[PDB]
């Protein structure tokens, strides 16, 4: 209940700050003021066109490595096990195959931002 109250208090504080920011000052709104910025000229495009990012393979690899992270994270409770040899071998194999995947992608130029 305590953490819930602190979360709600922080949310209410941020809402109070932005409500003060919006209801305190004086408003004078017109079209040239609220136009998009674009460094002092009218934008050619609509800023919603396709962007064509260059690190898409790195993003998918990040998804896979994040799930490898999720696999690796119960290690602080895994080291409390009674066997510890199969645990050590399994952790070594997991880190080794993750590193092998990273090395293969590096060799095949996956993380090189193909334009």
């Amino acid at each position: 209940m305590n953490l819930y109250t602190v979360i709600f208090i922080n949310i209410l504080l941020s809402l109070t700050l932005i409500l003060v920011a919006f209801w305190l000052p004086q408003m004078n709104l017109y079209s040239e003021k609220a136009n998009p910025y674009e460094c002092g000229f009218d934008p050619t495009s609509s800023a919603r066109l396709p962007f064509s990012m260059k690190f898409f393979l790195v993003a998918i690899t990040f998804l896979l490595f994040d799930l490898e992270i999720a696999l690796l994270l119960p290690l602080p409770w895994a080291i409390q096990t009674i066997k510890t040899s199969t645990m050590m071998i399994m952790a070594f194999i997991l880190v080794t195959i993750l590193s092998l995947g990273l090395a293969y992608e590096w060799t095949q130029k996956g993380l090189e931002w193909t334009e």
Binding site: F41, D42, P43, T44
Partner: protein
């Protein structure tokens, strides 16, 4: 008499280039009005394009017609891009200035101008 042409041998292909430029301007006017948030309508812009062609439409020298076509293509290119802004494309309409009247009574009532 005995001059060097620049694109057109005579007036016919100069008029052909004029028609091509006019087609391009006529097609580009709706896209310009949609992209740049213009107060005007599509009919007003096309009438302005016709007005500009008409005010240039008294010249019978092929070189001058070709140069007018070239300058019109440059203006059309900077309107195809958004190099020209709303102010630049609304400068064709003269919405602010009052035109000087064409009658002698008004030009006599104000100013010593012919």
């Amino acid at each position: 008499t005995s001059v060097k042409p620049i694109f057109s041998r005579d007036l016919n292909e100069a008029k052909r280039r004029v028609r091509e430029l006019y087609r391009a301007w006529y097609r580009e006017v709706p896209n310009t009005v949609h992209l740049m948030q213009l107060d005007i309508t599509v009919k007003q812009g096309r009438d302005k394009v016709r007005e500009m062609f008409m005010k240039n439409a008294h010249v019978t020298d092929p070189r001058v017609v070709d140069l007018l076509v070239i300058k019109g293509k440059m203006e059309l290119q900077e309107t195809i891009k958004v190099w020209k802004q709303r102010t630049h494309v609304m400068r064709f309409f003269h919405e602010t200035e009052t035109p000087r009247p064409k009658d002698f009574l008004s030009k006599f009532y104000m100013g010593h101008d012919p």
